[PDB]
């Protein structure tokens, strides 16, 4: 119009990020008292709000610093707040609000506001006509403009509202997006839950699970789904027996004294104690500082033991006494186990070894000078199997001193092998549990303990947890210790827990008369048990998916360090697929399909009943609103949000009558506003009944007149929850509040355009009809006779008989057949189609609805509908022109047709 | 005898610079010192090896700076071994695996399904200085299940690690979390949460502000609350507000339906009162005294007259009290020196936890000793102790005029006698002028000595050490002449003392039965929390005409030279929806102060307790040493 900015010249604001300016800047400017100032140019966004800008600096010499928030408000004198929901359901009529703000101090504004047309939406805004309204916004005020729309296609759709003021250069535009969502309700089905365990549930090490496609019977038509394949690992902590308490070792700290044998007797408990406490790491409860003195004692013992070292690098109780084999071997043992603690001479140990090897022997050891203390040798005391037992002992002492004395002593490996040969040969028929255990551990160090030998080693263990032989219990403890050391060598962790448990149940803490062997061995064995940590059963899964819609193979490696990691693989196709797992460990497979399910129960008005009626009052009408809470108790304080029909406004007296008591409230703000520009209203309820409908009513007057009236709306809800609300629409002209549209199988087309083609402006000719009806767009041209008019509540149906087929297109209708022409009821008066009358009708192919067996026609904006006068009317001279034109039209179209 | 003594922090950290102080009291000439750090107990590797010389020009006091490499769940220890001449002194020290600190910053506080989460990980050490290390990052759903792991490097990133994670359309709503940790220390896990929800930004903000920060239980007026609603662009709000109250007991909330009110919001403001009668009728307990210890919460829903926007806001944690104040002894040492003045640092706060300014406080029976709280709500009260071994019990009350004695706050504490070596009654007392201290100033540290005159002339110096952020910042000597009871140390305060530091000083001698005696004392000093440098963001152009949608603007950023600054601009509507998990400097200093190895305000039960409680290990050649520490965390769990 005049003195206002045109719609096309308005650039709508569209940039509304919740966060931005995710940038990085460096302060390289010349410092001033240590401060470097940086001027940075930025372009503000389109939002009208306050921005909080946060800065964080990181300097090499200053560290991290989080600055105070810097606020920047952005504003205009006049603007649009387009209040859009997060999402809206496809094909559901909703009302949105565009709130126009005028923040000028003392200046009212005459504003024209328009809702832009969008093919993806259905509204009064069409491609031909605009949806405008001229309102007046008072100074320091705001006005609310309701738009009623119907989302047609899903996905991120767009809404755009513009506004311009008269007599001033002041305009604003807002263009925002919203999500359009399928009719159904978000659902997911647990398609599969499978346990993955190839070593346990799989054949030949591989496990194949076949996963079925989801049911999807109640799936909403033309909606996509997403199937999630969720792999996870099952971590299992592997148990460990509690190590013996550190306090229970307080007595093993002994000062060494005596001669060649007693010295080692005093050295054994201390060395084995330190060796145990070091591995189990219990110096914390024992006392960190004490360990030093504990070391001092071991050093002392070693030095004292050096005094009895005969020139042959051997050992005996006394210097004149003949050197003992077992004693020298035991010194080798202890000193070899003590290298990690104190300074041990290589010449001593290895010299002792080379001594022991040549005077070992067949290759098997003979004690030519038995030790004076016969209680320090333990199980070797017995007269039976001297050779085998002594062999096992000395051999073990050799293999323990192998890595140290393999370079100097060259005869070590061969000798170990010869001893091993003898032990291998005569292992069977030993029978004594102690010897079987110690020789078993002697042979396990080589890995030569297999087959029938290993079988005898396993079956000789009574009660599956102990190597027992009639006699002293210390011999059995020593033997069981050796055997446990053997199981720790054979990696047989399935037999270890009972053994260890039995050792712990004996409560034997070493020390005492002839405790030497039983003290050394049980703690060496327990320390080695705490060494070979089994704390986590090995997890290493190889899981390969196999989807039919995928060319290659998706593989997954589940490790221990990332066992809890959720491994998701998504698939848009509803498929049946194959899963193949292999490897050690356990896992879980979860196939879960998200989709959209049709809902019989209504997703709208679940917590509220709302009835809205608009009736002609005895143009003034009566709006009646009846609401009821759908609960066990009454609803608390609630809101009635009423938007007027375009051109209507509530009666003040009725409102004043409502506001007085009666558990209702209308603010002074609402009651003070003039009759003009009062198109929205909020009635507050103190409570709404659940037992029956609470009803109110008031009169609405038409102050402005418009050809197209937009439906008004009523929205009820409780204050504590806006989501649980109900909304109904009302329209004076016959409707259930809903706009005109044609929907089928979740596909709806808008029907709010012109009733047909008028034909009013000037006058129609013969050239006009021939030129228009020959366009490629025009699909059909018929001469019809109105057989029947089916009046309906939504759409009028016009049963027409195709009297003559002037031009045929897609529809292969024959003369005599009938076709139904559908049109909105609002057009009924504009068409004035009477029965027993004839008409010239032509139309587009886009007006078909919907399939050939029951194919109907839609009278749209491009549908030519002209009255065809009867022959007796043609005899009149006034209808002469139209008659000549129509007859000519028929003749030319039938005989000659379109010339292209 | 030239007594050799070493001091090293209670806990040693890996990949961190650690200092070790070496002393050779009663010695002459140069003393060669070699410090070696080995692993415990195997001594498999020599973790450190430095050398230094103790000259008479340096008063036989030197230091060794060393960093223990992160070499390849019981506690781990190391052996620290210092060798001076012939003498060798070794000590076993506990080790923490913590490499430093990680701070996480997400661009927003709440996100819609489909949006992208932009976040930065700041990687620093215990000095808050940027480092280049490997960091493991885990994205975690509300259930607790990790859905995306990652392993990146902080090297050549200037201590800043920019990352992003895309949120799927199909997603589980609720509190999501980001959890990161250094590769070397998987036990130290830093986290930040962000809410995932379907929402639209509001156009205004609602503020629920009670008249008082508390509610006096015998106030007939009841809890009066002001509701303030204003648009995000500044303009006020006209509308209607629904206000409702509730009582909170621990985690149990009881709504008061009778207290529901509907009031008009005119000119962006409204007022609503919870009457005492309604409050008492709501609860099924006539005894109002039982309500003390519980809190009140207020929920307000504001609706615009247009009905096109609605905002709900809440104010919880309003304590029901019988006193406007609350006294704390969390900054006052729990050990005293018999016969010497005992200093108390009273900490008076409001029921909501905030400091209280200008509040008269005094000790029962000693009205003369009446002081006033400062800006930090801390007052100083010095009393005089008599020589005894009886536990000193103190009761402090508030003496705020215009307030009745029934409403005055009161608290009772107890302190134990500082046990001395062989009952020799030799004490040291450190006192400090109580005032908000800032970097760039100077603090007078008062050293007060007490002992018999038979050995008072032997004390010629004090050895003082400073602990900041869990490491030794500065160590030195304080010369004292025979006869002087009090000496003053002019300590220069810089930015390296932020946020707080402990000063532990001690002296040693040979007295009584020819015994070697060590007497120590420590004190905790708070410093004005701030950034080490500075960083300010302001307008880079001529003010004050408000900007326009799309308008170019200039941003003035002023900070430290060479510093890398990272930015983000966020709409305040977000904060109207969620204002949690926001990265501030106060939270940084909170984390730092919570990772402190000191556990006390000052002193200890004995001379070893002073060092141990202040996060230090002292070890002399004569045998005088602190007990071992096997607890990474301070008492008590
Ligand atoms: C509509 C529906 O069934 N939603 C489910 C939800 O309840 C469940 O918590 C989630 C777990 O993956 O799976 C989906
Ligand atoms: C030789 C050497 O580095 N000595 C240091 C000195 O530089 C430092 O000022 C002081 C504070 O901790 O510690 C000592």
Swiss-Prot record, chain B:
Residues recorded with modification Phosphoserine: 16, 48, 269, 275
Effect of residue 127 to Q: In ARMD9; results in resistance to proteolytic inactivation by CFH and CFI
Disulfides per UniProt: 599-634
Site ((Microbial infection) Cleavage): 513-514
Sugar attachment sites: 63
Effect of residue 564 to Q: In AHUS5; leads to impaired binding to the regulator CD46/MCP and resistance to cleavage by factor I
Domain of life assignment: Eukaryota
Record protein name field: Complement C3 beta chain
Taxonomic source organism: Homo sapiens (Human)
